[PDB]
RNA sequence: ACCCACCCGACCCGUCUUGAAACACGGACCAAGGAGUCUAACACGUGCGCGAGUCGGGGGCUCGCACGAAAGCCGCCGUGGCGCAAUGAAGGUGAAGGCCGGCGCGCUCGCCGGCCGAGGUGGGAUCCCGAGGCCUCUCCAGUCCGCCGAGGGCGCACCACCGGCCCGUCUCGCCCGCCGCGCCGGGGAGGUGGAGCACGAGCGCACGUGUUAGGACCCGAAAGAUGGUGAACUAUGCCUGGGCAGGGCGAAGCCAGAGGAAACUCUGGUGGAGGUCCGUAGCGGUCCUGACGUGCAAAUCGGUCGUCCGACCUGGGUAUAGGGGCGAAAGACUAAUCGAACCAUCUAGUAGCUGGUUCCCUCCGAAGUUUCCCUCAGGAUAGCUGGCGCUCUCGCACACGCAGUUUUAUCCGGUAAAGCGAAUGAUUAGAGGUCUUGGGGCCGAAACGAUCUCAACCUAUUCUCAAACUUUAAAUGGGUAAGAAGCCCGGCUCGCUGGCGUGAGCCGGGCGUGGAAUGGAGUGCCUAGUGGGCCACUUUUGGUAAGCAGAACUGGCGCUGCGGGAUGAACCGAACGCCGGGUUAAGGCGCCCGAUGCCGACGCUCAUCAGACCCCAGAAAAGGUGUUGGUUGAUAUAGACAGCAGGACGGUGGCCAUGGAAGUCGGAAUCCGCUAAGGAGUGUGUAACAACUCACCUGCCGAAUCAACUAGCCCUGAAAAUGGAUGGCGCU
RNA sequence: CCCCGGAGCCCCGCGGACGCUACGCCGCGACGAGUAGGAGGGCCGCUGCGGUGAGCCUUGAAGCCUAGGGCGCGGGCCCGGGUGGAGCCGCCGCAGGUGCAGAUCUUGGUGGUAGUAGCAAAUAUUCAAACGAGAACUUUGAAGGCCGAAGUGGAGAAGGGUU
RNA sequence: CCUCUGGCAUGUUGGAACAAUGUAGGUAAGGGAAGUCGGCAAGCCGGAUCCGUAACUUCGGGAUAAGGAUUGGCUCUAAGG
RNA sequence: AAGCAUCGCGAAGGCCCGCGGCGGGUGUUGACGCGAUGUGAUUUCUGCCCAGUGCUCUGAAUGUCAAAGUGAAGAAAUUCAAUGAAGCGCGGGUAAACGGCGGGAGUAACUAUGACUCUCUUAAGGUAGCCAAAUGCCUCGUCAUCUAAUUAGUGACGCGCAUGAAUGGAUGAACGAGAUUCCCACUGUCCCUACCUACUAUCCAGCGAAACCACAGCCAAGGGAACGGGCUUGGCGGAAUCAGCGGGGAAAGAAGACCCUGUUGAGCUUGACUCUAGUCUGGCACGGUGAAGAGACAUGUUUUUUCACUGACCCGGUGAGGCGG
RNA sequence: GUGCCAGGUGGGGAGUUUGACUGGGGCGGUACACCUGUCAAACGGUAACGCAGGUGUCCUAAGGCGAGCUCAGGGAGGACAGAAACCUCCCGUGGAGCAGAAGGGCAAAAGCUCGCUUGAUCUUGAUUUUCAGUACGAAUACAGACCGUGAAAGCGGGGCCUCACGAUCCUUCUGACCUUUUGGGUUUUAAGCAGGAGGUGUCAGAAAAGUUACCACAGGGAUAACUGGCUUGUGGCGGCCAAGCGUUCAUAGCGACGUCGCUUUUUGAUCCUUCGAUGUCGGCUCUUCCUAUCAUUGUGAAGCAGAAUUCACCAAGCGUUGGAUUGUUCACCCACUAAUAGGGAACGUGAGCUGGGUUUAGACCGUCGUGAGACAGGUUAGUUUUACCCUACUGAUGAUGUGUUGUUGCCAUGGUAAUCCUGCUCAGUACGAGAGGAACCGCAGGUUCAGACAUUUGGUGUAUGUGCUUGGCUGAGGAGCCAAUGGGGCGAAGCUACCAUCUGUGGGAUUAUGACUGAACGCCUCUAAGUCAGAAUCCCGCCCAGGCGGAACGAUACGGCAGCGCCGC
């Protein structure tokens, strides 16, 4: 009582019926697999980004003043 | 709508199957019954009520119950279920930070008073501001009905990510507090595991589907256990009764006679014994494998048979009862039942195994494949499929993304091919070189002294190869990029790295058609069936081959009708709601049979086995002056080809062959003379000869001929059994 | 520079269907195969129940037959005629023991076979009369036979129970 | 096998013809197993009287071995109380 | 089956039944008996082997050896050590128990073979007999004979795939509904068939079923699921029937018995896996009294060896009839 | 002895098991867990009991660093020493070695030799590989420590890379000032967490011997034994070439080394139909068909002088025997014959027969197995079921049209039939040295078959015709009867036998073949046009049946009612 062992006959048709997809590419991909010391220290950098907010806001205000002087000299 | 007639079509329904009209199974016909139900646990989706709550279970109070064993109500309105908090094996622990100021060295750490109060980035349906444009019967001013709104936002749900917090576990270190200053308790930073939190969503009832446990869609076993009933049949033991003609052989014992000496021996009788013989009744059943074999009969009849005084037959009573009995032993008998009787119950035992499964229409619609399983007739899991939806975009003047597609650049191969004068392996033959020895060898006592030979040597050559060889090396393919998730700037953070620097992450700002054509896309639940396949173009394995077994891409049949191939799974065309007109595909147009009933074109073909359209149903090597063409080489006026006609002599019995070659079984040889001409010869045939007889030319007829290959059609090769098939008639 | 209780118009900003069971009506475009299977609609069918039709019915209910008229693609349904004699149906909802062509299906009935196979084991019957509507089978008489005293004879037991 | 006493109507029916193939009996010239797996079936012999009876043997048998002759009727004779 | 030969048992026994008991069968019995076997009359013979599997004998000369008990540690549960019954191991016997009876080398004045000697796995290596058997693949072995012809029959040979001595060998009178071969007579078994008889079958008066049945029924070829009554192309086909007939309906008869599958059974066997009745042995209780004797610890405790009594308990007899001084 | 424990024995008895894949199943193998090269069609993936193989190990170094060298082989040299012992020089892309099978990789290495060592250590995750994107095993970068090596860069958490291995539960060990041991406290113990081990080779993992011929059940043509189907290796048969055999001479007859085809009359191969059954081998009987022709008819070629015998064609019309043995299919033998040719039809033929041997159940022997039992080993005895249905066929009534009937006939169509041998003359002739030895036409007849028939003969016989008889019965004689037809003789009629007898046919077309005339091809030629002879072939005549076929002729309803046919309309 022998039988048929293995084939791939109707399989490509079955696979292309439901539309073989590219994987779900998303913006801001995950960090699973990145090396742990560099994940550790980017976590420290994201922890200490809140330090220096007054310097960042003041320098952004001076950059707005610089763009205002530039558009005043241009217009 | 009843019957009949004609033309075309039309094999009998259900099922197992790759394939059914099947010489596969079920099936005379008709009426009635007849097969997916009910409870519980869940899961998902839907309908309703309430909502961080929900439900009244159970019970109690009202109505004596027609309607009722209904309904209404409850400091029981929550005892309790589920949810609202999870995580550890457990002791246990248990989900918030940020901004401003002050005190300690701001020491990224500890302690005090107010605020925001549940983080941030990107994509995000709706909404808000919205410059400006579009006007009116005329120019300005101008509150208003408006529409489109460039641009910017707070951003619902949801997704991706980065953060933050809770519990378990691990690493590095420090600080705080006391009723008992301890093997006390708590806290920090960073990894990692959880079914967690991150301003709830559940509860209760009802409906649909799916998975189960239950009889579980229905019918079905071979079985197992428990408790009983039978020895009227049969098996054996016991008790008490009944029965078994007539003949044959003649055991012991006994009598008499004869022969001899007793010893004894013969003869003639009598006698009636035998698990003795023929044979009746009785008992049983060898052979005809006779009769019958839907019988006289669920085991009989006829002839022929074995036995018939003892291991004989038989009635009644009685005893042995089922894993038991009993057996002159056959697993035989035990009530037509025996390799474990019968009746009832468990029991509607189980079955991956057969069969069947009951109304219509519409829409969508498969698989025989991956992996695992004592799995190969089956399940689970992915795949294929259906339903329920959600999130967005809009031919209403204004599209992000996606492909069995191509292009533009960029890489991958090691297959076809080709090569081995390149490597590895095989393998052919010459040529030149004492590389270097050796064996059969020849001249030599020997010598690399002359001749060559092969085993292994070299140098350039040459012939053929390789799925498990390869320098090369395609065609077809496989990934990528063709932008807003992209570039260009400015600045913070880092505990990584660090001569300064790098790298990564956060912010803020500026620039849009990112090659061709076509698409409206993304996503979450349940979820049946399937898990036996088969055929065909191309590639290919094993096999002599197969309508054989097994593979790769693709398409079909299965699941599919229709036109054609005469018939028909898979071939060609083409896919299907019911029709009318027209036009075709594939096939055809003498008749069957719709259409060439064209004054069709050009040739080939004669078959005493003609030939007639993929699959496909039949043919080969070889041969033919049968016939039609082509290729090559010759000769013909210096007077062809066949047709009547003169000849095969001499050196030469040349030369090995003695067993015979003056041509003669055969082989190295292989030219002159006469010359017009005979090749040291094509045959007839000889112990050898002799003889007959073929190149060349003349006398006669005077222009197309000869030879070898090769392609068409036809013929031989070519022989099977019922009468036989281009489908038939037939057709030149 | 006027209102349409009426400019009178291919549009009436004055109320605004004949067209609206909005679970309805209407207008374009594309498509239509199908087993196993899945989903939806049934104003398809059976039975019973709560409502509903001032429903039907001895001036004829259900059932059954029909060479009649029909409708729906279809499941099926509505009438016409005949039999029948006592209950029955439509709609909104609920519930189920709800649709048969098969299962060597269960029960019941009936065909072809078919007026067929068969009524053939043990030798054998024949003539006249009686009875009767009726004689091959009854009876009587006569003839010929068979069982042949281990019988086809005369009586018991087991068994049957009135034979 | 035939008859007497006793019993019966030929065994779930009869009539007409005498086809094949059957079932059960028989008979066949010549051959005698040549048929067939196989003398299967069928066929020969068979009672009694008088002779005669082998191999072998457990000395009992084999044995009715094998193989011959005779068998009727009528009329007598002899013997058997 | 008689004959033959074994095995066990002297009664608190052998074999066996029984859920059970001072239970029961043999047994109303006692080795000339009962129970379990093998072989199968008479004659003759029954060879060798105890290595294996069985069975059986004794043995503190003893490897393993459970429970109970003994000693040591601890707070104890617990652990350790010695002792350690029967049985398995060790050692004898046993084949009329199951059974087995092969190779190698040397060696005889022709060759060949081996009377003789040594060894193996494992213990001897087929003895007397017998045979191409009911037993022999080759094979239809070879020879003689029976025949015209013999794979048959009989008699011999042994090289015997794979004979063989109570898993009995050989012979053998009589007997056998046992199986084969030949001969005499005989016959339709046949050449080669023929005829007659009775009952059927045929027709008729009366009575009258059953199996089976998708629809039903004429063939050739093609294809098909690969042997068609139906499809296609041809041949063709004409009402209703009777008596036969065996070619077809892959005719009927029964869910193939053969072969396979099932994680379906049943009968049986054992060196399968778990168990169990019975049986043997050890410990505790029923279970008392005395005598001497050995061992261990140690300066009373334990293991105990046999004998004596009856008082528990068991057996036998009686009509419980004289038992002890 | 009893009651209760403990140990041995225990198929007497009980329950249960006896894997899977498989060109059917057992036996043989693992294609059952893995690894390499190929298959494999240039990403990956890809099957078979496809090919070559390998594995369940080994290593305290063969792991990890650092340093120095180059390996195999060849040439040249050197005392023993040669082809291989040891020393040196040169060439030396790896042609060696790296533990193993293979592939890849590697030259101041990944090889050899040294020096030091234990990264072959502990703890979180992530990823790859078979994959469902689950495990296990193996591997890949990292992270935190602690280390080794080196001067450092760095390298190393096993083997140069691809395999060398294993869930739940249970047990064992190790670790924490770890948790619980349920009223509280201590301790022993026990349970927990994590890591390692004890193993499931059927390798994602039951604990598992056989037999059944006494067998049973649910199924399968998913799967065999038969036949049918495809193929033809094999079996059988036929060609192509032509080195040779044949006194010379390849081809009269043969034919090596090679090669091309047919058949399903043999065995193979596959599993397409059948397991809710298709009766499984032989022999007997009987019919039809094929030719690959043994004989007969007609011919051609011979190493054909005659006889006899081989090769080849047309050709299946008619024949192909009786037996011993064996169940035989086959086989061999004896005899006859003209010759004793080969086959098919579900390996033709069991509702036709037989049952001989396969292939049930009972037995005996031999081998194997402890045993039950097995043995294409041998022997023995072993129930052969049904037609009355439809078709086909054999016979028989019939039927439709001819107005109805009868006589006489024709004919389409269908079947078909005759075959073979011996003796005499030819003729001891042709021929031949002889030995031997024909043929045509005639004459007489036989074999097989067919169709009849009973004068004779033989059989049958129940004219129950006639005698003779056994037993019984009617009183005896006579006459008879019964005894399933009493027996035995003879026997009428009728049936019947190659067991008696009679009869059995002629043409036409032509095949093969031999020819005529005569081209093509101014020659020749059976052929191309034409023409002749020509046979068991074919067809018809003879014979049998007579069509949903006709023809000619006769009579056609006087009756007690009637009714028909021709003619003019
Ligand atoms: Mg499969
Ligand atoms: Mg199936
Ligand atoms: Mg299917
Ligand atoms: Mg099939
Ligand atoms: Mg069908
Ligand atoms: Mg068929
Ligand atoms: Mg079936
Ligand atoms: Mg049927
Ligand atoms: Mg019904
Ligand atoms: Mg579910
Ligand atoms: Mg819900
Ligand atoms: Mg709960
Ligand atoms: Mg059921
Ligand atoms: Mg269910
Ligand atoms: Mg049941
Ligand atoms: Mg059981
Ligand atoms: Mg019998
Ligand atoms: Mg019989
Ligand atoms: Mg009959
Ligand atoms: Mg038996
Ligand atoms: Mg559809
Ligand atoms: Mg299965
Ligand atoms: Mg490759
Ligand atoms: Mg190539
Ligand atoms: Mg299946
Ligand atoms: Mg197949
Ligand atoms: Mg195409
Ligand atoms: Mg109900
Ligand atoms: Mg019905
Ligand atoms: Mg009748
Ligand atoms: Mg009768
Ligand atoms: Mg009486
Ligand atoms: Mg009588
Ligand atoms: Mg009678
Ligand atoms: Mg009568
Ligand atoms: Mg009677
Ligand atoms: Mg005779
Ligand atoms: Mg014979
Ligand atoms: Mg006889
Ligand atoms: Mg005798
Ligand atoms: Mg014995
Ligand atoms: Mg002995
Ligand atoms: Mg022994
Ligand atoms: Mg001997
Ligand atoms: Mg014989
Ligand atoms: Mg003999
Ligand atoms: Mg022996
Ligand atoms: Mg023996
Ligand atoms: Mg049919
Ligand atoms: Mg038939
Ligand atoms: Mg079956
Ligand atoms: Mg069955
Ligand atoms: Mg299975
Ligand atoms: Mg079971
Ligand atoms: Mg049983
Ligand atoms: Mg055991
Ligand atoms: Mg057992
Ligand atoms: Mg069992
Ligand atoms: Mg198997
Ligand atoms: Mg590829
Ligand atoms: Mg180095
Ligand atoms: Mg590290
Ligand atoms: Mg290494
Ligand atoms: Mg047997
Ligand atoms: Mg067998
Ligand atoms: Mg099959
Ligand atoms: Mg076959
Ligand atoms: Mg061949
Ligand atoms: Mg020659
Ligand atoms: Mg049948
Ligand atoms: Mg049949
Ligand atoms: Mg021929
Ligand atoms: Mg014969
Ligand atoms: Mg046959
Ligand atoms: Mg037949
Ligand atoms: Mg039969
Ligand atoms: Mg037989
Ligand atoms: Mg048998
Ligand atoms: Mg009849
Ligand atoms: Mg004719
Ligand atoms: Mg008289
Ligand atoms: Mg003629
Ligand atoms: Mg001619
Ligand atoms: Mg002529």
> Can you give chain A as a three-state secondary structure string?
CCCCCCCCCCHHHHHHHCCCCCCCCCCCCCCCCCCHHHHHHHHHHHHHCCCCHHHHHHHHHHHHHHHHHHHHHHC
Resolution, rounded to a tenth of an Å? 3.1
Give strand letter and number of the nucleotide nearest A36 (CA to C1'): F143
- The C-alpha atoms of residue A34 and residue A54 are separated, in whole angstroms, by 32
Which residues of chain A between 15 and 74 are close to nucleic strand B, CB under 7 A?
A: 15-22, 24-32, 36-52, 54-56, 59-60, 63-64, 67
The residue numbers preceding gaps of C to N over 2.5 A in chain A are none
Side-chain-side CA neighbours of A31 within 13 Å: the count stands at 10
Span CA (A21) to C1' (B658), Å: 103
């Amino acid at each position: 009582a022998k039988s048929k062992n293995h084939t791939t006959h109707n399989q490509s048709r079955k696979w292309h019926r439901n539309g073989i997809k590219k994987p779900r590419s998303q913006r801001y991909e995950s960090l699973k697999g990145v090396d742990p010391k560099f994940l550790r220290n980017m976590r420290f950098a994201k922890k200490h980004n809140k330090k220096g907010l007054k310097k960042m806001q003041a320098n952004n205000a001076k950059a707005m003043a610089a763009r205002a002087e530039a558009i005043k000299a241009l217009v």
